[model samples]
Target chain A: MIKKAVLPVAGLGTRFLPASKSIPKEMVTVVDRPAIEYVVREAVEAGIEQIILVTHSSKASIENYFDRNFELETTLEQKKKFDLLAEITQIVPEHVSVISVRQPQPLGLGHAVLCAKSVVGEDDFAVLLPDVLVKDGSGQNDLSRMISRYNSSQAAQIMVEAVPDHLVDQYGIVDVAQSPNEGESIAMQGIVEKPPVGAAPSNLSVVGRYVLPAKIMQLLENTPEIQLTDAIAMLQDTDTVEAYRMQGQTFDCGSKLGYLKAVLHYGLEHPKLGMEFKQLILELK
Target chain B: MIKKAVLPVAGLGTRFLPASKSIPKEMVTVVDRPAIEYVVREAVEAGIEQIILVTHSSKASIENYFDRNFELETTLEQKKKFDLLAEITQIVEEHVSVISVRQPQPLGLGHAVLCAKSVVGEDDFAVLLPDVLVKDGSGQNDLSRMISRYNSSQAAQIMVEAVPDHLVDQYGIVDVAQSPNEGESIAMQGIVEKPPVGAAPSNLSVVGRYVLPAKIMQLLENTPEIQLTDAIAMLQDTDTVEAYRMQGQTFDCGSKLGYLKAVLHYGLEHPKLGMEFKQLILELK
Candidate 1:
């Protein structure tokens, strides 16, 4: 149901380098796939037909990676390397679906998401951050979950995780109220960003995934100095935003520690890479 | 001089994936520049005028990386970001000197260097492996030092180290003959690849650095089955092959441990990345 999505990829990833120096951090691989590919794949799996990317000059390579390489495709076809060809095609879906636009400034995440308003148009759309990876294998479908809830509840939504009380300050804390429908998904009354230990209203923290109404675009257009995350939370003041809990392992690939963990996790799980990688780590140690 | 160089960039680098899945290993980055950039810089420093890259089809990203980005140059000029413009130009250099050919097979390190013959021509050339990073702080250039001795001696020159006995098998074992000259940079008489610990001639293993005559290239062209290092050693029968006791630390960027050692070495020395990286490692331990 959540057939179209938007991703904000224009941020200057200053943390992971010289890996990300000239290359966009979105292109950084978790195991064998680029970060953007995973996010896009999630959307595609969730039955999303269109993906909107808000990028900058530096993000062209990221865009190009997802597009068809005509010559390479033809050569691979002639060579009869079907497996590799299929892998390449998986990254780039049907035509005109993965459209991208330029976000002209180093603005906050909210401004970046706002740049895709015209492309997203009128429906409730999903937003994914390329720097984050959520390992959800239930096949229950994140977008489907949000879409089903949206039709019944008619509210702006995002994925939230229940973490320990002490670590609540690390994320946007969501204050919740019981949903009128009496389900696991809840209604939110208030939200605060990076709240101190006891000051946090609740332990639920909003992750990078989002399901928002196009109506929120007006509020984002009017707001200045709003980071990507904060713009979505602003809707809660009007009781327009809601929270949905996602089930999976979430990794913040933008940081060095996060990148290391992601690499080890995927490398260990992979058949071709795990054995050698573990041996290498042990011998190196 | 670096008339010919060999790049062993075929290792499946799972550390920086998603982008690396589609990209060849050579395209990995170090502060906005690809791995080939640093390798090329080192070759150019050692008087290399022509570079021979042994790559695969997936390595088009590696090839594309070295090609001219005229649009990028034009944009940099219009924006007056001369610093970035200079960096791009420095990395790509002039096209006349750079030549990359495809190694259609995934054989071994020996085969990769052998595949560069068409571009290597009929002249003795320096072989600078992408994996080997010889750190130079003391005015002494590692490749230049080896090449000067090889030029005078006309031997299949190799770089050797006085590594621990236990680690001797990790390298190409070399027979360190007494210096024909008084200087420490004198040529050695013999070398062998990956010998057993007790069987090794000495703890003087052959690092990936080499200065071989074009005849060796010709030999590799005809030999149906012969390890590259072994073939170089066979040159001894014809009064050929020499090893240089290189000065400075050699970081093997090919393996994870080698890469880790390099990170520690470079991180400790680098002004901007050292302190933070050191602190992070301390915390990790």
Candidate 2:
């Protein structure tokens, strides 16, 4: 019953001057956890058992993130942080969870996603773009609901969120006659790529979530969708693509302040840092 | 009995982004006044009559910090927040009026000063780098002492702080045979812009504050876009330029960490919020 999650994270992680050096942009830490961990954790919550990482050449440091460092573990345990020891070991629980494969050429997003396709040869697998970290309205995640819809109705799923007037042009706008209620999927008319600030059919803009069948791997023979958007548009020719409007927010970790914003967002609700963070924030006022 | 204080706030304020878009760095509020207000307050304390800001076109918020906001004032009064009303209204006194000048482009700090030369009109003027906050150890302000030294010697006084011997090369070292005592001014050989570690003449580094004569403005006109160090070195060749060792500690508010240190220290020392802020800190950790 467990479908694998494919995360395409091979780009240069442009704009981050720091993650540029040696570290894969995915390894960039938010609070204590690597930003990649949040997306992996998101997939796990939606019953994604195996995490397949489509990576570039600079994947060594991030690859070593979950590897047990016996020396450091002893030092921290000697220092007596029981929680630290558990956090180190239980990050993904043994080697069955993570898989890394090379994305030799970047023909764009679809090419990156298909690098790990052979492992999911027959199963319906969910594709998660690791750049955006999701926060569910909670209890059950939006992805879990999308997976349910995919399993029940036999249709492809794409995630989208509502952007306000004047900003519909900021993203790949989805074309639909009527918008679905939050957390539900509706038959999508088409995907309009960042149509301008004018009437965008509807205010729904494309977000980075997708659930597809292994047949997507069969479709990508001629080099690419060029990108994921093109790949999804091609799939719409034969099958129905459903758009799921999220009930909660997602932070774009790829942005300049975005990672820090999520760090503070999670820190304010974190078990250890939450009270102190909230207390510290109020003093400036 | 003195010259006007020329403050160059003509910056992109890139260090404080997003806010730098809508608000200038100096207009960023630091408790009682916009951080820029404290510098203006420092000038007023030194008995300077005019506060001339060499500013960018968009940094109007800072220029308007001194301007009366009748709308906010009347509303606060109507709400009976008299304390708020009094604090906001009494920002600048009648004796001083803040004026602005244009650099056309941000060629250099020297260019900013040269632009303000028209209003300064050959008078010996004090230039305060608004980023660093000079906190006087005792009640008598350090800037007032530097102004006094300039008044007596008729020499341009470059305010300096005694940097550590090891860190001497990191700063604009005053090339003096012997270091001057705190609150004293001694004639310098010439100013060296960040001299090498072993070659440093004295540990004193040029603090951004400067008290210069009308000759400096003329000297800078020729070099229009040159740094203040080169202008000072030229002034030293023909005249007696001295270093005034400051009697106060400083916060390098130009840097992000430096600004954080300034805020915490200033907030801790604030009379109304001091104890409360300290208690807040105690709870936070």
Candidate 3:
């Protein structure tokens, strides 16, 4: 199992300005829970025992959300609000430990992820981006599948989705050596970042979830622009880099359009609000 | 006293697209309450008995919000979820009647308001815009103050706010005949919609709240572009159209900036989340 997961939350979510002006973008709620919380829950469900949040000064709300609020707990307890108390207490599971590390600059993801190097040490870890929300209706989630692939091959793994041909230029496309077994992982020769329309090697675009070796941390330190794709491509020259096709709906919550879709999707599937929310949507002409 | 309020909710909230793609903007929540619920509460608190919501086919969710959901109520009751039951039951007060009238086309506010003429009959009604959320700290809300002014003067009243000089050009500026006593209502000679910055008569810009006579409904029927400001300006020709300064923080939820501000403002003041939210904000530095 991928016991440690590094979540890079330092990026200034400029797309969700005004709302993200005072609060971090990761703190924005999809329905009743913050976007980061869902990512944490997904990681925890996949047996991630330690969560390392690589964040900035403006992102303290993300940490505060997971921390225990004794005052609130006591108040709810005294008022006999057992449901609310239970809901809040489950913010962080008892077995999982959360640690925060600061990245002082507005660098790219490579730099943010490398900030967890001190804590992660030489162990193979998973990097889960809070911006991309994946929902697997088939019972197996994307990260858990990637961890499975990682364990089998002992190779660095990344989740890839087959996006539309027109959108290939908008994302980092994976260039694979050959097709692997059906519904299984494939080995990637290289990866291209936001390639021009006709130059994309494959329609398989890189998603946010990555299970990498400890060597990538050193590789990222020397990488220009702190681009993760460049580091991955360089690692592919000697080490094995595998790509796994994700099996569920993936939402790019970094964009307003994608964020709203995720909200609507999850809102309509919520346990309590689902039926009412669906009825409301149906009533809309 | 005004016994009925007409809420024009037929306009497409293009500013909040994607989020408002399938749902009405009025259904967007500020904290835990939807935006329209606050407007309804304000009217009900002002002793208004009937709420005439001028809506479109796409806005059935707003009507459904006010209607009783027996299934949901029973579910909550059976589950012993008293907190959620109480929260939802307060969507509409017992004494208030909610009536929805359809506006078939994408007309202006004046036309939308005119659609409610049949239901409003000859009563002097108030128009409360669901997009504008006003919070009063001293307990004297803007609608109640406008109602008080309407009772004392028996004139058509419109709420005004002193925005920055630069922002005066963005809103309908009230052309006051003469300044009235401080904290009191004043007579408006005319109202200019989106006046040129330097040419604006006063910095007092008209807000969405208005208490108008039944004659303005007729005036709006014949008005060009169905602009509410034009009808108000023409109504001033025969009736006393007064401007009352609103005493509270008014948030224009139609815009992203204003909506986020309202969220931050309310999120920080929320009973359970307030102190923690404030502390997180302070930790940003």
Candidate 4:
């Protein structure tokens, strides 16, 4: 089992300011929940027992949010506000352990993941970026399916979305050996992060989730200013890294348009406010 | 002159839960601005220049929100998203200074204000609570009027509202000498914080805006675990505290019901979404 997961949230989310000004970008809400909650829930659902948050000084609130607030719980119990109490208490389940490590600096993803090496020790772990939210309704979830593929192949795997050929240059495009058997993983030959126009080897662009061996952490430490994609490409030289094409919708919450769309999508599905929100959006249109 | 303003927002905000789980309660927005922005703007409009945010570890985001984001501004400028660029850049004016100090504990409002003593530096200061949002429609704004009263009397003054006698016990009720001349300040004798249901001294309940002398900060320091109302009452014992009746509606954003009402009220006045939001609310009804 991929028993642990690392979520890098140290970046000063320059894209989503002033909203991201005080809070980490990961703490921004899509509906009622912060964006990181969905990512954490997804990790928990994928059978990950431990979650490591790679954070910075300004993000202490992220740690406090997941930790227990005894005073608050007691107040809610006294007030007999069971519904809200349940919602808060269930935010971090008892079965899962959440740990935070300080990244200290604004380095690349490689450096951020390396900060968790001490805690994530010797385990084949998952890395889930809070920015890319993948929704696969009535289909296999991207992370779970990637984990399944990792188990079968016993190899590092990354989730990729099939971007349009014209837009492939905007993302890290994967070069695969060949198309895999039906609903199976593609054998990643190489990958390029943001290739020039018309130069991307394939249309499969790297998305956020990754299941990697402990060896990748070492590669991350040895490489100066290493990009995760470059490290994966290096790992591919020795062993296989599967490219798992995502099955559902993927929203880049890191971008303005993407974040707004995710908000609208989630708002339309909210139980109490969904119908009303849809009506509001329609009325505005 | 009340050049320094203290915004005490270290409260856990137990009432705004799940949403307030990872973020400070003050970060919750009514329309586009977080609740704290409205309070800050009110202070700025009343001619207060240096604002001190007394915060807890969980609320660094509040300080960050009001601070400038040069990287974000640069990106917005590069993208030519001029409208949003303007909106964020103008959040805090260049002339105003925002400083932060940690409260370290979940203390009362008085303690929070005391944390700002160094920044305030022997000056009369304004205390604006983000939770109690007062909207002064066609009438004078609460804080501006309170400042005017402070200028004339040079005594500590608090904004109060006349709630129904039955609801007076829910707030810090003020005991005043008599109704003041029209547009004049009432002479406050004393105040009680949430007095028993039928024992409230008067129907005039203390609202959150206050222009207090530097002596109140000393009172806050001497009294352990002091509530702001208690500190004001102690100050009232030696000198006078005027009760400036507010000419506006105040919403308690600390509560779920109050937050929703504030949202609706602001949405109705929103330049682009107001008409549509109203239409949608009517359709829902």
Candidate 5:
């Protein structure tokens, strides 16, 4: 079982510009809670009991958010705002531990993931990039399905989503002998980073979610040179690593327009806010 | 001339709730820029050179945004993304200085304005509540028009918009001998803050823009950890305070629905994203 998950959150999120100038991009709000909270919740739902945040000095706010805020909780309790207090107090179940490890430098993605080695030692774990939000359209989340696949097949899982053919150059495209149907896994030949539109083999690109065994960390120890996909490629050379096509939609919280889309989508579904927000959308139309 | 403006940005934005929990409501982006940026731009357009911010500890993000971002500029420059670099480089004109004073507690609006005392000392200034965004529909922005009248008459100009009679209870309704013509100002008696729907003096409600003389600061210091309307009412007792009817639109960024409207309005006008966003809205239906 993948009981642990690693979230790389060290880089200065300049793409988010002014909003992420002080707060981490992961901390950007989508509807009611920070976008990172959604990612964490996704991991928790997939049976991740220990969450490792490979973070930076500036990213302490992310860690602090997951931790207890005694005074804030006390004030909420005193105000008899039980619902509000419960929202924060149980953001994650008490059994789910949030751990942080410093990624001392502005190293690349692979190095950031390597920083969590001490906590995730010798365990098959999942890596989730906080910048992307995956919204499931059905009962179960994609991550849970990936974990279930990993358990049965004993193979690494790399999450991918189909992208527009013309925009293939904008993402990391996966190479496979055959394109897997949605929610299915197929052995991948290799992953190509941003291939030109007509040069791309397939439209399926990485959506920044991965399930890997402890062997990858050993491969990581032999390297710091960014790009986790590089290690995955090396692993694929010797072992079978399958690409898991996602059935859910994704939003890139790293960009302005993408963040807005996530807010609009999630907002239209909020239990308490849905009716008014939907009305607002219709009224504006 | 009212060459300085005060922005009261100390509140936690309860109305914005979870969105404002981790992020300051003013920092929430409408389309390409934060809502507060529009307010500052409006002040600059009205000839205000110094922007005074009455901020709280958690609100430094707002102050930092208007300041220099050296590293970000360097990256953009080195990458030759001059267009992107220039977009953030000039949020406000170089001539306009952004200064912030700390409001140590969650005091009322009047107290927040009073905190800007040392910086605004004895200077007639405009107070713009960052929560309310004013979008002008004509050649001149409403605030600019307000300042022009302030220059001519030298009487306090309190911006008011005709609200639906039923919603008068949600805003501070201004009292005047007779209702002023649109884009015109008239000497007023006082302000009724959120009077019952049927009991309102008129449908003209204060839209949170105030152009006042330095004498008002003296009154703010005299006695008031209270409402700004109470201060305006006291000023009306001794001197002439005019209500300036607005000929534009206002969105309450403090509320979720209002923020959504601001995004929709400003978004439809966004130079680059307007066409695409409009299509998205239509497709969303």
Candidate 6:
């Protein structure tokens, strides 16, 4: 049931620079916590025990962050800032095995995922990119439900979101499968990355979260120099990768405008942060 | 006169995380612009030609931000988003002569200042920390005034504020030599970082901005190891190191509370942003 996960953090994250210069893009904040931290929390909730990170040399700051800084931590503890301390200690601990694998160069997403081959071992693994954060209406992440679907289906799974036909080219298009028994979130046949506007197979687009079987790793390894999208296409040819539509809002943390939108969206939804943030935006509007 | 500047960008920004976790502190945004962008803007206003950023491996993102991103520039140009592209391109091109040096470990500010010695050559240099952003009452930056004052005095100078006695420990205490003559800034005897409340010699507290002669780099090199406080004590030994009551209010972008205040301070005071931000804050209060 998605007990282990991997986060590919080797991207140079050029889009969010100046800020990304010293920090990892995964560590960028949405509301209060970082995008990666939220992804970790989702994994934790879904009973994840190990979180494998495939990173590059530029992402060392993230490693140091997960490690304990005695002097600084002690100072925070002394200040009786429990919330801050708790947040500080939440990244990685003995309880959650967060192993790091450094990628020499980020050839592509397929290569990055392959870098975690040794650490992932031989079991089902979830892949969550920190650049995309998802939350249900009540602020609960629906990642667990997606994992549940993966367990029930016993198929390669990817998260998808319903989008207009015109926006399909911005993401991987999915051939949506209908379910007579459902609310939101249905199964899907396969996916295609960035298809043309009218050429898209369906309106559902892959949204950066995945639950794939160990077989896909083997498939990825044998694929021979494919981008992440190419790998997905290869798996789709075998019908091993299934798409699961997400039932929550997704925050794209990859671009400047997207990051700012996340701050506004989540900041306006958080109880303590929302009222103030919305007021500011409303005044601006 | 300070025709060149050095910015220390190697410190790990732990206070504001998941935001700073993957990004440098300089890149944190207040309003729409990153904090370092504002600091650089301030330096540019003072007719500064070169910007030497003392950095490390983690700060590559900062360097990338100041260098040209040809594709991004082209995209913005093609999209007819001229204003946005102009602001960004201006930062990399005409702002200042941006260069970088590496700091391998966590050292005191004095050592950080010393790291830029070789690149700064024999010229007097301005050190503008990303943490201190100067904003005038009219929403303009007054960094040029500080630089001009340093030229007239021909001494190691720092920006100072008359903070309350209770908060003296939050800053470097400064002893005044003489008050301002009409429009001129106040003169000073010395600077001390974070003196105790009652032990503070004067109400004037040293702000982060500095314009020091090349000789101070050697003094910083020879300065014994100490916390920020000890460096202040060493500064007193150099009678030439003086303080100037800053011409504008300084925003400390070091703490979350301080960051929020800075955001409010700048946002609420901006001609386009301030009035809206003020109304928003008032609504929340």
lDDT string for model 4 (B1-285, tens) is: 668888888898776778787787788745445778888887887788998888887576687777667766776786698887788777878899998888888668877888888888888888888887877785457788879789889888878777777776688788876755423587877888788878667777777888888898889877656788778768878977788877778888887556655665666777765665566445532
lDDT of 3 at B85: 66
lDDT tens digits, residue span B100-152, model 5? 88888776988888888789878888999989998887878989988899899
Model number with the top DockQ? 5
Instruction: Residues B63-171, candidate 2: write the lDDT tens digits.
Output: 6557665655664665687775666667778777789888677777888888887899968899999988988968889889988888888988889998778887778
**What TM-score results for chain B in every one of the models?**
0.83, 0.95, 0.94, 0.93, 0.96, 0.86
Error of 6 at B171 (Å): 6.3
Q: Where does candidate 4 clash, by residue pair? A: A22-B61
The TM-scores of all predictions, comma-separated, are: 0.65, 0.53, 0.56, 0.69, 0.95, 0.72
Residues A118-207 of candidate 5: C-alpha lDDT, one tens digit per residue? 889889999999999999978789999999999999999999998889999998899988889998999998898889899998999899
Positional deviation of residue A115's Cα in model 3 after best superposition, in angstroms: 1.1
lDDT over C-alpha atoms for residue B70 of model 4 = 72
Question: What 10-residue stretch in candidate 1 chain B is worst by lDDT?
Answer: B179-188
DockQ for candidate 2, please give it: 0.02
Backbone clash pairs for candidate 2 read: none
Cα lDDT tens digits for candidate 6, B113-161: 7788789889988888877787765443556666777777776667767
Docking class of 3: incorrect
Off by over 4 Å in 1: A92-96, A141-143, A163-170, A177-183, A196-198, A228-230, A271-285, B1-24, B29-125, B131-153, B158-209, B213-239, B242-285
**So what's the TM-score on candidate 5?**
0.95
The model with the greater TM-score, 1 or 6, is: 6
Q: What DockQ was computed for model 6?
A: 0.21
Ranking of all predicted structures according to lDDT, beginning with the best and ending with the worst: 5, 4, 3, 2, 6, 1
Candidate 2 vs candidate 3, DockQ winner: 3
Which number leads on TM-score?
A: 5
- Residues B70-162 of candidate 3: C-alpha lDDT, one tens digit per residue: 655665676697776676676667888899999887567888889999998888899988889888776767788888889989889888888
- Tens digits of per-residue lDDT for model 1, A123-218: 778888878877766766565677777778788776877788999988887778742231236777766889988898777877788888777787
Which residue pairs show backbone clashes in model 3?
none
Residue-wise C-alpha lDDT for candidate 2, range A197-216, written one tens digit per residue: 88687888778888887787
Tens digits of per-residue lDDT, candidate 6, A115-162, equal 888877888888888877776674446677767777887767767777
